[PDB]
Design a protein around this ligand. Structure first.
Ligand SMILES: Nc1ncnc2c1ncn2[C@@H]1O[C@H](COP(=O)(O)OS(=O)(=O)O)[C@@H](OP(=O)(O)O)[C@H]1O
Ligand SMILES: Nc1ncnc2c1ncn2[C@@H]1O[C@H](COP(=O)(O)OS(=O)(=O)O)[C@@H](OP(=O)(O)O)[C@H]1O
Lengths: 573, 573, 191
């Protein structure tokens, strides 16, 4: 086999309870139901699949206490991370929860019944104690700011009975239970396996690092990246995974397996590192790389590191032998251009080439689109990591016109459309004031509130189109700063926004009115008409100001085109 | 200059009335304005800029009749096609229109004042005589059916005065007036110039007709394709011009010029031809190519060809000498594979290679994406002509789910999103029932009418996104066939639509309801709730039927993915 | 729904277009299930064959197929083997099974007699099909249309397109000689 489960027996509860599936499923229907948070879900998944072996439920007091203070569960097995389910008095009463109560753990994403937990105790934990003992104490620590702003007042210990495994629709082939991974290592004659934990990109150095370990420890590699619960439309998450997959064939043929790991990290440094060692051991890895600042939060508001570069490694080594897993401490190497190789911080003769790119500099570049050294990260991988920060020539954008009724914005807008359909870089969506009123706001009025709603409605549609990479041209009146500000923020989430104030003077608008709407509004036939009986909050930081009285349309369209051209949006075909 | 104008003087009314622009301008601010149609604006453009010399206003009765019988204008000059403005008695009176009346001719696209027509008469045309001798007759003919259905009872003759150029925002570099083209031919020393008339794609044999025709008449080439007024989002149009532009570099360097002619064709065969010949002569061409069925409407109901394959070429030679311009009747050649050349319907030895693709076959192919012979049409040109019939792997599409409240469609929808965001071919827009209700229909109700409006609202947004190439997933209840049919038609205009009926049985939906909405609706706390007090018109031709009681979501999402995959939409990366 | 394909041969473009069409029409995925007997440690021919199959795998729509080896000792018992085959794939979880002309066929005796007719396999698996609980997918192998750059049934071809179809005896012949092979016939990396 690979490495034995932590505690000697894999707590594969889904396998254990499979035979009763349908009955637990039936009863899971009636029981009082607690709907889990994202953290309790990620935990439940590893509890159920034996990832937290020997653990087999959410921690009760005898486990939790000896874990918070001794890094051990009651039975004596090493375990450095509190795994608990929390509730408030309201719900504990509200649902009659108490020792012996059987409850249903529900998935907040799709409402599935995942498990049935038979209660042990319902204690009120000392969070001040937990934060200091488990995460260091700093009020700024992520897991602490969480333990005090989300975790409820009480913990509910209790063994778990698995009914259904969580449903994930992204990358099922890359999701491996500890059993699947163990079977896999076994089919291929695998014995020693070095697991690599990460929550980041993965470049050349990472590739050279894992390979060297594998080769020196005469072993195979498990690339085990961490993911939390997937956000249906979180493209960043898909980009990340594709990055990893892209990197897979740069590894010696047959040496590695890529596997996603559903873990809700605390960023509890040393303590998480030990936890991690356990989880990989359960997953069948025999070796675990531990890095500098492993699972590290970084530094507080006033530059204090929450942990030192080496505490992780010092922790996992202290327990290493007991746990039965080998640690592989990495001494990351650099690049030697003249050489075309990589070597330890020492295997480099004085004066070779200190070629090493910065992470802050890499992000910086990925953002700017500034070429990245192929010696630093493979092409196909970088090609994918960039997609989450696309080139302006690809981004959709919204041109949001605003100004009095009949200020010429409609004509300007139509001409901008023909102009942009000629440059042909994207599809163009036109949302004229009236079209919007007819299609999406036919039953709204003109009160401050109603107009605001109408604009939020244009922003929403514009924001979806901007996200699809379209060029959206909107020409509502948008009399209020509050509205326009809203539209700008809504759309910015998906691409760029430009406010063009068609500042044509009112008098000009009225005089040229050939529909008598200003006339009717003047004589009360229309209530609170903008400019007449309702205000027009003149824009203050418009991206472009124009006057249909002073400039022709092609000239105006062209000023708009110039702004877009100057920001890289139009890099033509 | 090239060939002298028609009649002898270029009717550059715009140039003329230019020193009086502002004056005639302000005078049009008050005169009784009339908005012209597209056929009228296109006739107005060539009148105000001389394209129609000697003609200089819409033909009053004198001009109009001698043309219908003698093919001549009043003053004796040849002119085979009527240029008349029209109106109905309601408007003749409404504004008080009689000879000596000064009307303002308005542009519908932007309400710009273009010309001031000072009447000469207001007669009522024998739309029967005209349509018979002028357009050949047959009750089918496109111009006839326009004449009878669209042309008003009476025509308004009167010379014209130019007040504004007429704003086009596309391809200004390709838009030439007869003056502009004359100046260009003059700067280049161009004497003899051969013009080409087309309303079609222009492939390779064309580049062979033109070059061969010009090199033998020792001349240069004016590629003069036609265009009516531009519908701001008539992508096909930009595609066409782009095709023409890509073809330009396939010409012996400097041999040809590309010019767009804003002419409204009447598809009036032999007579339109002769009209064309004058238009080009006014534009400075010394020669004109006249083809088989030039300006032909093809066939009629029973299959009768309105004109003979040579009624056009032979019609122009009758007046050829008088007009001044010379005719270059083309004898289109074929392709010789073995040879790698093209030659007349006779210059081909018995048994070479009758390689000639069909037009009906080419459209057919362009549609299907079936490769097209480079000997037939250049690559870069065909690459563009296809963009108006994109590959399914590029088209956006809408997956429109429908079924009872809580039928599982929401969960299906979310998983379809994750699934589609993993395949990453397009951006994905999720329009869940509630999101839609909150963002676009927050103030609609649930009456037959209201729900219908809500769906039309989803269709609109979905149709814009489908057009931008997005994957749209909508999960409203959509209880009515009328609604769903509407959405299907709205979206089909921009891409594909799939109706997925989440046919989960009501009982199942109620039993599983964990929000008590079915409960409340049962006891009257909610009026006309679908399934309870309001009907659910079960779909009949759903693209896919699913049951959330019988199938898991991944299995359901996968059936949906299979349909998409099978229709070429997912051709992955 | 999963359509299994049984073979003991190479696998080219036509085979690729065939399996795909079935999958698409029956709204299903594909199981490429080639047959292998016990491996001869140094039988390079066997490694070549499998690599051929693997090479062909990415020419299949992303996500549509799975390649799986099947340890079967065939008898070349035509009709009867075909039924047997249907059973084995059904056990393997396939819901559909393609049955070809001369499925698991020995060919013809010393004096030109076919041991079975082109269609007996299909007639056998259909006779039992419903009882067994597996759907048969009879293939109507298509040809190639050069002018078109497509493939179509022995009928979907207008009179005079291009009867472009390479022979198996001619393919072996070529593979041997090293004489170029039409990319429209078999993918490059596979050949
Ligand atoms: N009280 C009042 N105030 C302002 N505008 C009014 C009002 N009542 C009607 N209209 C007519 O509706 C169009 C203005 O719509 P908008 O969508 O621009 O309004 S807003 O931006 O939400 O404030 C525009 O008409 P269209 O030309 O049909 O768009 C206005 O003339
Ligand atoms: N009379 C009536 N009929 C149907 N549904 C009703 C009704 N009244 C309210 N609701 C709640 O609104 C959601 C259903 O809205 P839909 O937009 O899907 O319905 S429709 O397609 O417009 O007919 C859905 O709620 P959410 O799922 O919370 O959005 C319904 O429970």
């Amino acid at each position: 086999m690979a490495n034995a489960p932590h505690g000697g027996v894999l707590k594969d509860l889904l396998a254990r309870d499979a035979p009763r599936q349908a009955e637990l499923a039936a009863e899971a229907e009636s029981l009082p139901a607690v709907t889990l948070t994202e953290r309790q879900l990620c935990d439940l998944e590893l509890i159920m699949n034996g990832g937290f072996s020997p653990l087999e439920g959410f921690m009760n007091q005898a486990d939790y206490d000896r874990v918070c203070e001794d890094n051990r569960l009651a039975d004596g097995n090493v375990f450095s991370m509190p795994i608990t389910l929390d509730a408030s008095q309201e719900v504990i009463d509200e649902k009659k929860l108490q020792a012996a109560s059987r409850i249903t753990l529900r998935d907040f994403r799709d409402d599935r019944n995942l498990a049935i937990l038979t209660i042990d105790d319902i204690y009120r934990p000392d969070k001040t104690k937990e934060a200091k003992l488990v995460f260091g104490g700093d009020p700024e620590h992520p897991a602490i700011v969480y333990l005090n702003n989300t975790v409820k007042e009480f913990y509910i210990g209790g063994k778990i009975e698995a009914v259904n495994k969580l449903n994930h629709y992204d990358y099922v082939a890359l999701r491996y239970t500890p059993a699947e991974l163990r079977v896999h290592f076994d089919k291929l004659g695998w014995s020693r396996v070095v697991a690599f934990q990460t929550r980041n990109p993965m470049h050349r150095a990472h590739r050279e690092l894992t390979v060297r370990a594998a080769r020196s420890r005469q072993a195979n590699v498990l690339i085990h990246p961490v993911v939390g619960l997937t956000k249906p439309g979180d493209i960043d998450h898909f980009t990340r995974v594709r990055a990893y997959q892209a990197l897979l064939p740069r590894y010696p043929n047959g040496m590695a397996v890529l596997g996603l790991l559903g873990l809700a990290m605390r960023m509890g440094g040393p303590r998480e590192a030990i936890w991690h060692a356990i989880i990989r051991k359960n997953h069948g890895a025999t070796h675990f790389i531990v890095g500098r600042d492993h699972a590290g939060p970084g530094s507080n508001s006033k530059g204090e590191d929450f942990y030192g570069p080496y505490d992780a490694q010092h922790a996992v080594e202290k327990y290493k032998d007991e746990l039965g897993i080998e640690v592989v401490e990495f001494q990351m190497v650099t690049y030697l251009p003249d050489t075309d190789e990589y070597r330890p911080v020492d295997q480099v003769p004085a004066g070779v080439k200190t070629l090493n790119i910065s992470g802050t500099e890499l992000r910086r570049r990925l953002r700017s689109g500034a070429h990245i050294p192929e010696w630093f990260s493979y092409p196909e991988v970088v090609k994918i990591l960039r997609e989450s920060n696309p080139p302006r020539a690809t981004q959709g954008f919204t041109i949001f016109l605003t100004g009095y009724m009949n200020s010429g914005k409609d004509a300007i807008a139509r001409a901008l459309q023909v102009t942009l359909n000629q440059q042909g870089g994207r599809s163009v969506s036109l949302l004229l004031g009236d079209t919007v009123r007819h299609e999406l706001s036919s039953e709204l009025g003109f009160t401050r509130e109603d107009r605001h709603t109408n604009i939020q409605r244009i922003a929403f549609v514009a924001t979806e189109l901007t996200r699809a990479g379209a060029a959206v041209i909107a020409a509502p009146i948008a009399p209020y700063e509050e509205s326009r500000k809203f539209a700008r923020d809504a759309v910015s989430q998906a691409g760029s926004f430009f406010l063009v104030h068609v500042a044509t003077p009112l008098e000009h608008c009225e005089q040229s009115d050939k529909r008598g709407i200003y006339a009717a509004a003047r004589r009360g036939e229309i209530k609170g008409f903008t400019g007449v009986d309702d205000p027009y909050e003149t824009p203050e930081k418009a991206d472009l100001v124009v006057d249909f009285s002073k400039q022709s349309v092609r000239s105006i369209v062209h000023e708009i085109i110039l702004v877009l051209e100057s920001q890289g949006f139009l890099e033509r075909q």
